[PDB]
Design a protein around this ligand. Structure first.
Ligand SMILES: CCN(CCC(=O)O)C(=O)c1cccs1
Ligand code: NA
Length: 330
């Protein structure tokens, strides 16, 4: 089997991407944020505290003939941005892009933090990291990908995110029309439960490539590219008037600037992030200071190849017995 779904930016900055997901019978379609940095499939629901729901579409298990309470199971998650959610668990049928899993754990939110409530466009998350990170207790649950894997034509999914445009998540096959050149594969460590890999270095603009190992994770649920402070300082030093502001919480730059590209290494391959991808616009409406898309990881504890990096590439998440990541230009 295979599945193929379109993923759409939630706003004009590509702050996140939403993908429609069918849950239950008859189908309830919710727009979920597919997150390769977490392992819970959780939704706004009929159980969510009413004051914490503001425009989201909710899952109502009582209206699904295939929903069953997973008796005694609870969940609670905290993300790297400080947001959180918790609740109870149902099993139900879940379909993405024509690919169906029966018996998927659907984590129903009773509580969500303010950042979720305030984002009316995101109805929940679909985690695509390793199932070792799933927060359901006392019985940990599998991701949608881990439940689909054995049925797929090939044990893979691919992320093809757009710059200010829709893109695609495919399950079970590699669309050889979706990228240019060849795919370069690289090793993954699952020791922390993430798609963790090692980049072979970087370049700023037309500058020379610096060969240096940069461990990090491939995380579709993180907007920006978070790298070591040395690398980030070398990038922003090429932009007149750029600086780190602790008042704004990251690198800012004059909106009048033209930004240089940023290249990262995948083995001998190179992925080039155009300068425009690194512009996240005004720090507040009407401001002439703009927020940078490459930020320091020094206050995180991990480097994160978020959407700014991933949407420059066709990315293969290979869940074979020995997992790998693949990257290609497009
Ligand atoms: C021999 C290089 N090479 C493949 C790179 C390519 O895909 O061309 C590798 O070492 C791999 C190790 C782990 C996954 S692939
Ligand atoms: Na922000």
């Amino acid at each position: 089997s295979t599945g193929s779904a379109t993923t759409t930016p939630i706003d004009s900055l590509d702050d996140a991407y939403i993908t429609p997901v069918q849950i239950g019978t008859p189908a309830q379609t919710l727009n979920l944020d597919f997150d390769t940095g977490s392992s819970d499939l959780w939704v706004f629901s009929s159980e969510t505290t009413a004051s914490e729901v503001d425009g989201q579409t909710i899952y109502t298990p009582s209206k699904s003939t295939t929903a069953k309470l997973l008796s005694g199971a609870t969940w609670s998650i905290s993300y790297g941005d400080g947001s959180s959610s918790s609740g109870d668990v149902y099993t139900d049928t879940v379909s993405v892009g024509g690919l169906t899993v029966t018996g998927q754990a659907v984590e129903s939110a009773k509580k969500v933090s303010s950042s979720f409530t305030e984002d009316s466009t995101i109805d929940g998350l679909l985690g695509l990291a390793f199932s070792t990170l799933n927060t359901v207790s006392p019985t940990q649950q599998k991701t949608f990908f881990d439940n689909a894997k054995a049925s797929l034509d090939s044990p893979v999914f691919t992320a093809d995110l757009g710059y200010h445009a829709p893109g695609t998540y495919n399950f079970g096959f590699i669309d050889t029309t979706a990228y240019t050149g060849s795919i370069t594969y690289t090793a993954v460590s699952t020791k922390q439960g993430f798609w963790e890999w090692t980049s072979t270095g970087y370049a700023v603009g037309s500058g020379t490539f610096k060969s240096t190992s940069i461990d990090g994770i491939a995380d579709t649920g993180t907007t920006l590219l978070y790298l070591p402070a040395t690398v980030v300082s070398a990038y922003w030093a090429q932009v007149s008037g750029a600086k780190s502001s602790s008042s704004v919480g990251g690198y800012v730059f004059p909106c009048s600037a033209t930004l240089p590209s940023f290249t990262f290494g995948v083995g001998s391959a190179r992925i080039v992030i155009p300068g425009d991808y690194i512009d996240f616009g005004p720090i507040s409406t009407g401001s002439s200071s703009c927020f940078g898309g490459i930020q320091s990881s020094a206050g995180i504890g991990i480097n994160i190849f978020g959407d700014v990096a991933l949407k420059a590439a066709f990315v293969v998440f290979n869940g074979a017995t020995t997992p790998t990541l693949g990257f290609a230009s497009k």
